[PDB]
């Protein structure tokens, strides 16, 4: 019958995995004990987004809202517009589409409207420089996220356009068993409706932490003012560590609230990135869920990805249990032969998924 899940944990992934696998699923007991049970407003909005890009899918919501049964259709994509409720930023909705965009009958051209940043969801600079490059390694040659207008919280008002021109049969098999060597650190600092000084102050803080390093540091100052700068003032930074040897990237991001000092946030995010590099082996933890999903849906072939022990946390475990419930694929881990470090190699056999929606 239906694969059953409990709670709202990994809600979007469980929906995304079902769409890729084509296996119907049921999610029940969604915030049953809460005073406000059932799906939140943005969760329903996400399901509407899934319906728009897919065709023939049947989605039902329980009369109490605490149970959802999803019968996926085929990914059809097309051109559309989505209005994102203020409860979540655009990055929340753009992220799951990346898992599905390359595998559609027609190219994804989705215009997203709403808040463009938050403390808990991917930003534009995260997606543009932190996630999309990972897809590029997996064979998505043409992918872009255009920023038409930045909308900072709480009023938002931004506009970002997702265009994934590359439609490919399935991801290439991944073979990465070495720790990439970082060549330089790059990033974009952005602000809205405020003076350029705030941007110049954060980069000063970020460079303070990172000046000790032996690699080049160049952080772009992207000051947004005028009609396209949204309705609310806001500011944040994203720092990306780049390894040109094999096109691997590591990134961290945070945004500033009212009452914060830009130099402190620049110091934190610059201090923040170093922590991720220590915890990472081949991909960053915030990149790992995308990397793992792509490998399982590859050809019927063994791909290898090097992962650090720190990356195996609670989030990682639940991802590997959810994926097994859908695809029945088991991720195997073997120690590396080296003794300088304690990394491990994740070997995954792809399920032989093929993009059958595409015209030939």
């Amino acid at each position: 019958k239906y694969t059953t899940f409990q709670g709202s944990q990994n809600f979007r992934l469980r929906i995304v995995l079902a769409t890729l696998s084509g296996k119907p699923i049921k999610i029940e007991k969604i915030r049953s004990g809460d005073l406000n049970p059932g799906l939140k407003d943005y969760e329903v909005s996400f399901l509407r987004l899934i319906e728009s890009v897919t065709n023939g899918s049947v989605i039902e919501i329980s009369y109490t809202g605490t149970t959802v049964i999803y019968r996926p259709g085929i990914i059809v994509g097309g051109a559309s517009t989505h209005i994102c409720p203020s409860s979540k930023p655009v990055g929340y909705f753009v992220e799951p589409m990346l898992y599905l965009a390359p595998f559609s009958k027609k190219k994804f051209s989705i215009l997203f409207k709403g808040i463009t940043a938050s403390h808990n969801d991917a930003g534009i600079e995260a997606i543009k420089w932190g996630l999309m490059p990972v897809m590029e390694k997996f064979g998505v040659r043409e992918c872009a996220l255009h920023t038409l207008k930045r909308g900072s919280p709480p009023l938002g008002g931004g506009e970002v356009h997702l265009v994934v021109d590359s439609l490919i049969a399935q991801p290439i098999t991944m073979h990465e068993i070495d720790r990439p060597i970082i060549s330089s650190i790059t990033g974009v600092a952005y602000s809205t409706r405020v003076s350029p000084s705030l941007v110049n102050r954060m980069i000063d803080g970020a460079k303070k932490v990172l000046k000790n390093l032996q690699c080049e540091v160049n952080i772009t100052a992207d000051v947004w003012r005028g009609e396209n700068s949204g309705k609310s003032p806001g500011w944040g930074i994203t720092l990306v560590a780049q390894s040109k040897q094999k096109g691997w990237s590591y990134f961290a991001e945070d945004i500033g609230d009212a009452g914060s000092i830009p130099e402190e946030l620049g110091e934190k995010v610059a201090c923040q990135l170093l922590e991720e590099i220590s915890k990472s082996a081949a991909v960053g933890r915030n990149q790992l869920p995308l990397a793992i999903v792509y490998m399982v849906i590859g050809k019927e072939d063994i791909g290898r990805l090097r992962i650090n022990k720190e990356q195996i946390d609670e989030r990682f475990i639940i991802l590997l249990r959810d994926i097994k419930k859908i695809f029945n694929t088991e991720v195997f881990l073997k120690p590396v032969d080296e003794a300088d470090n304690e990394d491990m190699i994740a070997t995954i056999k792809g399920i032989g998924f093929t993009n059958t929606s595409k015209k030939i």
């Binding site: 059932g38 329903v44 319906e51 065709n55 023939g56 899918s57 039902e60 919501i61 009369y63 109490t64």
Partner: peptide, 10 residues
Amino acid sequence: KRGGVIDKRF
């Protein structure tokens, strides 16, 4: 367009 969200929530 085939299928969609059927919302029977009161």
